[PDB]
Amino acid sequence: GSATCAVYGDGHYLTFDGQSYSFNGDCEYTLVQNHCGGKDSTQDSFRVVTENVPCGTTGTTCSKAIKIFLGGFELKLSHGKVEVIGTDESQEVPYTIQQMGIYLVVDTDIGLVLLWDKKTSIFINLSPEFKGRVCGLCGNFDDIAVNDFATRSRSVVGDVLEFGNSWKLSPSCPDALAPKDPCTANPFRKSWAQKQCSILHGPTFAACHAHVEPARYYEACVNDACACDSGGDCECFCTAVAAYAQACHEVGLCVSWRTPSICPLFCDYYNPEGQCEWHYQPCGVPCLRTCRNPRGDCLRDVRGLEGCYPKCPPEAPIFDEDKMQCVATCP
Amino acid sequence: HHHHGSATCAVYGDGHYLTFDGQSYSFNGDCEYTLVQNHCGGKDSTQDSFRVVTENVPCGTTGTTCSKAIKIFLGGFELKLSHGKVEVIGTDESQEVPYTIQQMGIYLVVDTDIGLVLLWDKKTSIFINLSPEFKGRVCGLCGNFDDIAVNDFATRSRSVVGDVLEFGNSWKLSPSCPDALAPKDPCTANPFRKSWAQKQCSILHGPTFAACHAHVEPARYYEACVNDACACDSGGDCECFCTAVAAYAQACHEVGLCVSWRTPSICPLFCDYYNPEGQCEWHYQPCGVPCLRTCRNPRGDCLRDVRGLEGCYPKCPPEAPIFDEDKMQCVATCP
Amino acid sequence: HHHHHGSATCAVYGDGHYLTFDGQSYSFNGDCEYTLVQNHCGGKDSTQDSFRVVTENVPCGTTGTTCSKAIKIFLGGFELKLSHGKVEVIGTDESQEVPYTIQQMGIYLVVDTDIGLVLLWDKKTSIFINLSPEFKGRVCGLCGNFDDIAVNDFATRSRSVVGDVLEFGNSWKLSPSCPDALAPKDPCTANPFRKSWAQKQCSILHGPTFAACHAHVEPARYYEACVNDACACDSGGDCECFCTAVAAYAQACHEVGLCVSWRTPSICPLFCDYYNPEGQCEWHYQPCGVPCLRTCRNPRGDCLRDVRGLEGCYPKCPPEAPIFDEDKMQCVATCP
Amino acid sequence: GSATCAVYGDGHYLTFDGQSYSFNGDCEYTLVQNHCGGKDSTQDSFRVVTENVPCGTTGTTCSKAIKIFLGGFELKLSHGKVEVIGTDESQEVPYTIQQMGIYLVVDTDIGLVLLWDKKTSIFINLSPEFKGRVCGLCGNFDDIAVNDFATRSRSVVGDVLEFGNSWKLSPSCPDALAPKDPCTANPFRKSWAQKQCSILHGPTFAACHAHVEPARYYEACVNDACACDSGGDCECFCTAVAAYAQACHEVGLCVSWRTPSICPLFCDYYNPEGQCEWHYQPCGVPCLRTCRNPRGDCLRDVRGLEGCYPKCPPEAPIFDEDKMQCVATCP
Ligand SMILES: [Ca+2]
Ligand SMILES: [Ca+2]
Ligand SMILES: [Ca+2]
Ligand SMILES: [Ca+2]
């Protein structure tokens, strides 16, 4: 059905076709190109652009900002803040911004939806219609995995570094280079990294191990924890584990991996004084009664979510999107 | 506000000590060091042994150690605190238990019957709250408890020594263990972490602790936060920062002022995890619940002695209000 | 706000008995005003805020003795006058926060000041003064100079020691126009017929119930005080005279730490059940005096208990609603 | 209906037929004698005599101990206790002693009821069966007020002193003399006496002022307060006020006046710790089931028994006449 491309952590990319690799560079790159070859007709113009900056001793880079071109609308994402720098006289809002759980989801009627975590991880979900007519970091969107290493031109080069360098926004940004092992660079952190990422091999994800392999995710976790010594290693570990959790939720499984000791949430903070209406749902609550989407409306899309959700009481059951409360009716 | 007649020794982070009389200093050394002793030798004025010892261990590549295991020997009993669990190594023939273990909030409250109550968070920090009864009878790393700060460096030799390192090594336990040295500058050792350290520790200068800024200074605590963040380069810097800020938070709450600082962005708490399915009995309390009806406290009795028991507590409904001291639930009654 | 645990006690009760902070005791009387406690000691200003207390003493019988009728407090421009169990506020500027916190406690109208001084009033010629140690060696007046020595008292307003109690009182009197005082005849000699009744009433001091305090506080001086105050007081209400005389010794015993339950339905009774809500029994006599309560002014967790020994009727809140609603006379579960 | 005499304070009297006066003298006086002529009259003889010992330096006598004789049964009463001396194993003990309220009450099957407050005050209740048959200081019960002051040998004189001296018992006791003014003797106490006894004119007795005049009771209060100079004027003041309250409650009016300011009680003292079963009942408790008092015995004994009362909780509702507790059932 709908495809999925994942970008997270220290240059970890998952193509639409399932291919994975690593690539880091202090430059802007296009995760997906709509008008591959400038086919402006019979299609809606859109783009997804990521901004990377080095975030460690080894020089590896991580995503910091997300800029999306969308039919004459340009949106800027940075530290959980959505910004608009592009609009059109049509006055219609093609995109909808929602805060479902920890994720900040933007959906457009054209069939595209981005599951952008507020910190550093971005997920792309595309309708099957755009199969075979998009290209870029996320792949060419067909059933064949090998051909996805195609440059900005139609030429196919097997070098991961060459493929990454080809899709740079401007020649001004420097060419990327193959990174050394952060674990080798900082062997002292290796033991702590292994102990932290051992949860991926723990009993918590044993159920998901059947449908999704943890090996690549395990080495990604340990490498990221070895790196990002400049601060917030807990953030790196949390992002890696959250990426694995979202991958598990892709197939439909649901695991409550979060504990008060590791990567905990603060659902009680959003809770109103005295009144309790918030809980953490590992699977996510689909089709909750909001102002825009009351119980009359519903959508089984964006499968796979987690975080704090408002347990609306039966009285005043419709959630207030802009007031963060449960109300009987909405404006 | 201004207070007199109570004291509490504070040890947290990497060698950050706060004596009973208010002295603050840094220290290091992979050894065991006595914390407090009342007998001050063979002289026992109808008291108990009352000896608290702490074992250190280097954490990080900068040669800076942090507290990992804490043993409290009292009346022959030996209780070891490590890996977040209370362990008892020796039980005396006196069937009367001289200590009570309660998980009040995040802290692992250890309260004794002789007016001594401990405060362990299972993570490289400890607060030794002491009754004013033992005033002037305290020999150890937490000062003389004579309400004088300068003489707290009398060392085990009982001669005042200017060097904090000499003081600590005099109070050291194992002769075979190596002597301490001057700690290296952490931020100088790891320059790249300085910006992140400042960004994290800026919370102390932020508006959240505006009320505490008037009463308790944040400068030393901010310096400790920056130092620990710079030094914690062997993983788990988030825990270092959380403990550093929590020390100042508890110090502010000790004077009586209530301050809420935890946010989902910084040092979050996940007490909804303990919440039974569809109950929401637990909630967040900055000052903590002063007292509640537990299995071990079925009466509405309230000690109300220690201050600022941070964490999340269960707001039991009026039906079945007495809490379960063992099964973590709001039950109708206890055995 | 926060007050230190250390304290010193000065007491005055009945027909003009006094108890200095140092421990010195002396009998005195006079129809004048007297600065019991002086902060600046004659205009010598310091960093600490200036405060001063004074009492109005009127004749209280036909033997010439005087008992403290009205208590006047001066601190930071604020003037508090106490009379007939009420509190008169005269000096008050709203540009500054009120420094005192009046709060009824047992049979005492506890008025607390943020400086470090708390005052206890019995509404019947009885005053208890508690002072923070930070004022040691700085205060002066009838309550003493607050040092370890006791015989070095009788420090006149002229910063001189005269030794004679009468001359000390005359020099530390306030009103210049008011006449000189003098030790009068023995009231028991004046009214010998009441001597037997006085002995019968005050025998409780030598009674078995005070044997525990006998080893800590010598009742002999208190016995003489009780006998003398039972004598005179001929203008009516001798029961109040005897009750406050006994209560002085009881409070002195409570200051040591010992607890005595001396009140019986026959001698100095208290009508605790009067304050009890209809069909409910929460008020109960507490000889010790409960150190702290759960109120709106004092929240559930707050238990500031610097002062001890406040005997009186006290509401024992039910466990379901342990928080007491002061000024509402009920126990609840929350405060606004 | 049933007659009622009363004696209280310094020789203040109120006959059954409403005559009110004052008297004094340190001598035994026959309050009530069942035989006017002293003959058998085909009826057992009951005789009640008190001793008005001097009370106060001013020279006014007041009752201290009260002696009661009937059929060889003597119950010396003093110091708040019953001291039975005279008794007869024949027939059956014709008296039961109870302590309802503050009052100590002894009742006889013949219809004569005595109320004692243990402090210089006595109240008599007599059935109408004895009307026109009794003689004593309390006056002959014949519904006539003028025919009172009946001296011995059935003679009437206008001198209260001579009437009392005729009814005197001790041959050698001194003759009574006209009382002086205690307030004139002690003008200093007069201000306090007036201020304290002004409670009678206060609003708390407004509901009873119309039914019974307070002027005589106020005069008695002020005179006794002036007279009381040996220590304990509170006692005589409380006795006067309680006498007026009992006179009011005899009519049926229900008045509550006890407050910690004036004449306080100590009901809590009887209450055991954690057992607040005792309470103050100014109006009296008509129905009780204390031990000998049968369970569910909601009948009437006397009206106006003001005092602390042990309100029994519903469980174990039988109060203990000797233990001061609520038991299930006394033997
Ligand atoms: Ca492909
Ligand atoms: Ca010291
Ligand atoms: Ca002195
Ligand atoms: Ca008649």
Residue numbers in the entry:
A (entry chain A), D (entry chain C): 899 to 1229
B (entry chain B): 895 to 1229
C (entry chain D): 894 to 1229
The authors write:
Similarly, the structure of the tetrameric 6xHis-MUC5AC-D3 Arg996Gln assembly was solved at low resolution (6–7 Å), not enough to reveal the molecular mechanism of the non-covalent oligomerization. Surprisingly, the 6xHis-MUC5AC-D3 Arg996Gln adopts another conformation not observed in the other variants as the protein forms ring shape octamers. The His-tagged Arg996Gln mutant showed a high proportion of octameric particles in cryoEM that were essential for solving the high-resolution structure of the non-covalent interaction. Particle subtraction followed by local refinement let us solve the structure of a tetramer forming part of the octamer at 3.69 Å resolution. The MUC5AC-D3 non-covalent tetramer interaction is driven by the TIL3 domain and involves an interface area of 385.4 Å2. The interaction between the MUC5AC-TIL3 domains occurs in the arginine-rich loop β1-β2 stabilized by a disulfide bond between Cys1185-Cys1196. Intermolecular salt bridges and hydrogen bonds are formed between lateral chains of Asp1199-chainB (Asp1199B) and Arg1198-chainD (Arg1198D), and between Arg1198B lateral chain and the main chain of Arg1193D and Asp1195D, Arg1193D and Cys1185B, and between Arg1198D and Leu1197B and Arg1198B. The comparison between the tetrameric MUC5AC-D3 Arg996Gln assembly and the free closed conformation dimer shows significant differences only in the TIL3 domain region. While the tetramer chain D shows only minor deviations, the TIL3 loop β1-β2 in chain B changes its relative position with C8-3 and VWD3 domains allowing the interaction with chain D. No interactions between the His-tag of one monomer and the core of the other one were observed, just His-tag–His-tag interactions, supporting that it is an unspecific interaction that stabilizes the TIL3-TIL3 interface.
